[PDB]
Each structure stands twice: as C-alpha cells, then as structure tokens.
Amino acid sequence: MNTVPFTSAPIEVTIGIDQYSFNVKENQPFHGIKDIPIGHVHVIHFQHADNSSMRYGYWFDCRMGNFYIQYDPKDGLYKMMEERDGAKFENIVHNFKERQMMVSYPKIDEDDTWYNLTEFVQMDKIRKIVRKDENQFSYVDSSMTTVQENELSDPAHSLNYTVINFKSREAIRPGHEMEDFLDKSYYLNTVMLQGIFKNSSNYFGELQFAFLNAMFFGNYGSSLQWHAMIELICSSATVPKHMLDKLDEILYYQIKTLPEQYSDILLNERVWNICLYSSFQKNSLHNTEKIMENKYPELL
Amino acid sequence: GAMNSSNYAELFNNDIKLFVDDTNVYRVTVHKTFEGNVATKAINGCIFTLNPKTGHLFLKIIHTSVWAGQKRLSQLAKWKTAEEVSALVRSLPKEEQPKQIIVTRKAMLDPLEVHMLDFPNIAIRPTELRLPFSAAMSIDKLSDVVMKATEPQMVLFNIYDDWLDRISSYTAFSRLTLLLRALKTNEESAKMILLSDPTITIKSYHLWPSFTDEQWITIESQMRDLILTEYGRKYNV
Numbered sequence: 001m002n003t004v005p006f007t008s009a010p011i012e013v014t015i016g017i018d019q020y021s022f023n024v025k026e027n028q029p030f031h032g033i034k035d036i037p038i039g040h041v042h043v044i045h046f047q048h049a050d051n052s053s054m055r056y057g058y059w060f061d062c063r064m065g066n067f068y069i070q071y072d073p074k075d076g077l078y079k080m081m082e083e084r085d086g087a088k089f090e091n092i093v094h095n096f097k098e099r100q101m102m103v104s105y106p107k108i109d110e111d112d113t114w115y116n117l118t119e120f121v122q123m124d125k126i127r128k129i130v131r132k133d134e135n136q137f138s139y140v141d142s143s144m145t146t147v148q149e150n151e152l153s154d155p156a157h158s159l160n161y162t163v164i165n166f167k168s169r170e171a172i173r174p175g176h177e178m179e180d181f182l183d184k185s186y187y188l189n190t191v192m193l194q195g196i197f198k199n200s201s202n203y204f205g206e207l208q209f210a211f212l213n214a215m216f217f218g219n220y221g222s223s224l225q226w227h228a229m230i231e232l233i234c235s236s237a238t239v240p241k242h243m244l245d246k247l248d249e250i251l252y253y254q255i256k257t258l259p260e261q262y263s264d265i266l267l268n269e270r271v272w273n274i275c276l277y278s279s280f281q282k283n284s285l286h287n288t289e290k291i292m293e294n295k296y297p298e299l300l
Numbered sequence: 301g302a303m304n305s306s307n308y309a310e311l312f313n314n315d316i317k318l319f320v321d322d323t324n325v326y327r328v329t330v331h332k333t334f335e336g337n338v339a340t341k342a343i344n345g346c347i348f349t350l351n352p353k354t355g356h357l358f359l360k361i362i363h364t365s366v367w368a369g370q371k372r373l374s375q376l377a378k379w380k381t382a383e384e385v386s387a388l389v390r391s392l393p394k395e396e397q398p399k400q401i402i403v404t405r406k407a408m409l410d411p412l413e414v415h416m417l418d419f420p421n422i423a424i425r426p427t428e429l430r431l432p433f434s435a436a437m438s439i440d441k442l443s444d445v446v447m448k449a450t451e452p453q454m455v456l457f458n459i460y461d462d463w464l465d466r467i468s469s470y471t472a473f474s475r476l477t478l479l480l481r482a483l484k485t486n487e488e489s490a491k492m493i494l495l496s497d498p499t500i501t502i503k504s505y506h507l508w509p510s511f512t513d514e515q516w517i518t519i520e521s522q523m524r525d526l527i528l529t530e531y532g533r534k535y536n537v
C-alpha cells in the first residue's frame with residue numbers, strides 16, 4: 001500500500017481519489033491519502049470550493065516513484081511533484097501516519113470497481129496521450145482539447161487520442177466506399193487494431209482512459225473519443241468474439257459507475273441507441289443493454 | 301450549407317455547380333406472382349446531373365443489369381449514384397470540375413461525400429427547395445433514350461435547348477422548373493399544353509418546342525393555371 005502525502009491544504013477543495021471524494025476545509029490539517037492499492041493506475045483530482053470551474057487532476061502509478069501534492073499560490077492549484085530522496089519521503093510519510101493526518105483509500109474488499117474501470121489502462125500509454133515527459137504522472141483538466149478538436153489551440157496541452165473519423169480516406173478503401181462506410185470492420189481490424197493499436201488491450205486502454213477523463217473532469221473531447229471507440233466496434237460486422245465479450249464488461253462497469261445526474265451530458269443518445277438497437281452488435285452487449293435499460297431508459 | 305430561397309441567385313453565378321437528382325436511378329414495376337405474392341421488376345433508370353447555369357445535362361443511364369444479384373437495391377442506388385457522379389467529376393478537366401454539388405434528397409449526402417473524399421475542395425450540399433427533377437422522365441426524348449438502352453450509357457443534353465440565346469440562366473431555370481412542376485402534377489394536361497398546336501415543332505436537336513418569346517409567355521401562363529388548378533382538384537378550393 002502506497003501514500004500520496006500533501007504538504008498542506010491552504011484552500012478549500014473537494015479531493016477525489018479514483019471513484020472516491022472528500023471535502024477539505026481551508027487550512028484544515030490534511031496531509032494526504034494512504035493505503036492506495038498497488039497494481040493499478042490512480043487519479044487524484046481537485047475541484048476548488050470557490051471556483052467549480054476547472055476540475056483538474058493527476059494520473060499516476062506509485063510503482064513509478066514517490067509523489068506528493070503541494071499547493072502553489074502563484075499558479076493557484078494543487079500540484080503533483082516527485083520526491084527523489086526516498087528516505088526523506090519515507091520519513092515524512094511515517095510522521096504523518098503517526099499523527100493520523102491522512103485519509104485512507106477506502107476500498108471495500110468485495111469491490112472490483114476500480115480494477116474493472118482501469119483493466120487495460122497503463123501509465124506508459126497515458127503518457128503518450130498526455131505529453132509532458134519530464135514528469136512520471138500526467139495532468140488533465142476539464143478544458144484540455146484533443147488533437148482532433150485542434151484540427152476542426154496549444155499543442156503541448158492537448159490530449160493526443162487516436163484520430164477516429166468515419167468519413168476519412170483512412171477509414172474508406174478506394175473502391176469499397178459503400179462497403180467500408182456501412183461495415184467498419186476494415187477500419188477497426190486492419191487500420192486501427194493491426195495498424196495503430198497493435199492489439200485490443202491497447203484499444204480498450206485508450207477507451208477506458210477517455211471515459212475516465214470524461215467522467216472525472218467533464219472533458220468533452222474525451223467524451224467524443226469514448227463514444228467514437230464504442231461506435232467503431234459496434235458498427236463493425238466482424239469483431240473477435242473475445243473483444244465483444246470484454247467490451248460488454250467494460251461498458252457495464254462504466255455505466256454502473258456513472259453519476260446518475262451526469263447521464264444527460266455524458267451519454268450521447270444517438271451513439272447508444274445505434275449501438276444497442278441498430279448496429280451489427282445490437283445483440284452482443286447483453287450486460288450493457290440490461291443496465292442501460294434499467295438505469296437510463298429515458299435516453300432510449 | 302443548405303440551398304434555399306435566400307441564396308437562390310447563387311445558382312447562376314460563375315462558380316461551376318451541379319445538381320444531382322437520384323429519384324429515377326432505381327425504378328420498379330410491382331406485380332403479382334403466379335402464387336399470389338408480390339414481386340418487383342426493375343426497369344432502366346437514370347441519374348439527372350444538371351449544370352443550372354449552362355443547361356448541360358449529364359444523363360447517366362442505369363441499366364437494369366447493374367441490379368442483378370444485388371441486395372438492398374434502395375440503399376445501393378444512392379452509392380451507385382455517388383460512384384457515377386464521382387466518376388463523372390474525375391473524367392472532367394480540372395477547370396470543368398464543379399466547385400459545389402447540390403443533391404436534391406438529403407440521403408445522398410453521405411454516399412456522395414464518401415465517394416468524393418479525394419476532392420476535399422468540392423462542397424457537397426443539400427437543398428430546402430422541392431425541385432421537380434423527378435419529372436425528367438416525362439420529357440419524351442429523355443424517357444426514350446433511357447428505356448432503349450441495352451447497356452450503361454452516358455448521354456449529354458442541353459435541357460434549355462437554345463433558350464440562353466434569348467434569356468438569362470435565372471429565367472431559363474425558372475422556365476424549366478415550371479415545365480417540370482407541371483409535368484409532375486398533371487402529366488397529361490402539361491403535355492397537351494406543350495404540343496396542342498401542331499405548327500410548333502421540336503427540332504431534332506432539342507427537347508422542347510420552338511416557341512417564340514410570345515408563345516412562351518402563353519405556354520408559361522397555361523402551366524401556372526394547371527399547377528394552381530390541380531392544387532384545386534387536389535385540395536378542393
């Protein structure tokens with residue numbers, strides 16, 4: 001179990017850690033989060049009490065270094081940093097635990113939710129979508145634009161998701177126009193899976209990361225990426241059977257975890273009605289269709 | 301974006317543009333089978349591709365053999381249309397290619413856009429106008445070349461005959477759409493109007509009769525009466 005200590009909490013803020021969250025009052029004696037499960041990526045995220053504008057946060061993996069949070073009063077935000085001196089870090093953390101100044105990552109033992117939302121997400125791939133190579137952790141916020149959004153404006157601050165365009169020369173083989181537009185298997189299997197992602201695990205990893213950025217930061221560009229990756233699979237007549245079964249599980253846990261009150265903005269009615277009821281895979285997502293129908297029957 | 305009554309004069313500016321109408325690409329005769337079921341029999345069709353400024357009509361005849369062994373013909377017809385328009389554009393010299401293609405039905409947008417990915421600078425546009433180009437098969441000489449074709453064929457016409465010698469393209473298009481609207485609302489009456497007087501003939505190299513300016517005013521008035529009338533006989537007013 002690992003720890004992300006905080007220097008202090010000078011401003012009132014709601015802090016999230018994965019799917020959990022808690023309020024910290026201005027100058028409350030808070031010094032971080034302990035008992036963070038090893039083996040998963042994690043996200044620690046922030047919403048200031050005085051400006052709900054800009055949710056922001058940091059993707060990290062404690063196996064990759066010792067990380068802490070420190071408020072910067074010049075830039076006005078809680079910043080993640082790496083401590084290179086391992087003995088200094090251990091000594092700081094141990095003092096904070098002895099004084100019981102940390103919240104415990106509150107994982108229920110039955111609960112596989114975080115695993116199920118991050119199964120294919122790896123820090124190395126996050127760091128290629130979020131380019132800032134001098135840090136081992138990655139910053140994301142509500143306003144960051146994707147490369148595809150920048151094509152339709154700061155490139156260093158972009159989310160480099162894989163471009164998905166259904167009316168593009170990449171998607172459509174000369175002479176197979178109708179075939180490739182109405183059945184996207186070529187684009188899914190040859191162009192994206194074999195060509196760009198190499199395997200379905202990397203595809204699912206980006207899909208899961210896009211969903212989590214949409215949910216936790218309200219990142220609109222990530223929402224489009226998530227809906228597009230889903231639609232590319234559902235609009236393919238030919239999909240490996242293991243991929244369909246895994247997609248059903250992935251989406252099930254995403255829909256299960258989604259705040260009931262964010263469904264209106266985070267779920268695209270056209271994509272979901274198409275995927276569940278018209279697409280080639282309309283009958284291949286049993287778990288996802290059942291939870292969608294019982295939780296969000298309005299959308300459909 | 302969409303073409304409507306507000307940007308109507310744009311059709312007659314000097315940017316090359318084509319209208320594409322696909323309503324006569326897939327045509328069927330519905331009939332009973334010996335067993336008492338219903339079947340369709342396809343007949344030859346055509347793509348109606350028209351330069352509204354010059355009157356040049358690229359009539360691609362769609363022979364029934366193109367449907368043999370194919371499924372979902374209604375959907376295939378839109379992609380066949382788009383494939384043929386794309387092939388037409390590619391066959392034209394660069395300086396003759398259109399800058400805009402306006403489709404008369406919204407379901408042609410994606411098929412044409414996908415077939416024209418190679419031409420990012422050609423705008424594919426819908427229209428809010430209800431244009432009567434379906435009635436093109438009521439022009440006898442066009443109907444005749446379509447129904448006689450034994451193979452795929454492209455035939456080139458000027459749908460304005462020699463009118464541009466005397467009138468502008470705005471006026472020629474207005475005349476064309478009035479004639480076609482009339483033929484679409486009451487084909488028998490419209491055709492009676494156009495040919496009643498045996499002394500006015502259609503030149504071999506034309507589609508419509510050789511009306512004088514004065515006779516066109518008479519003709520045009522008789523077509524508006526027809527359209528208003530039928531609108532009476534239809535709605536009872």
Ligand SMILES: COc1ccccc1C(N)=O
Nearest residue numbers: 148149152164224225228
């Ligand atoms: C991922 O899809 C997109 C990306 C950028 C902008 C728009 C879209 C979209 N769904 O149309």
Ligand SMILES: COc1ccccc1C(N)=O
Nearest residue numbers: 323325326327328374377
């Ligand atoms: C008779 O042609 C059809 C039949 C069914 C549906 C559509 C069409 C058509 N031409 O688009």
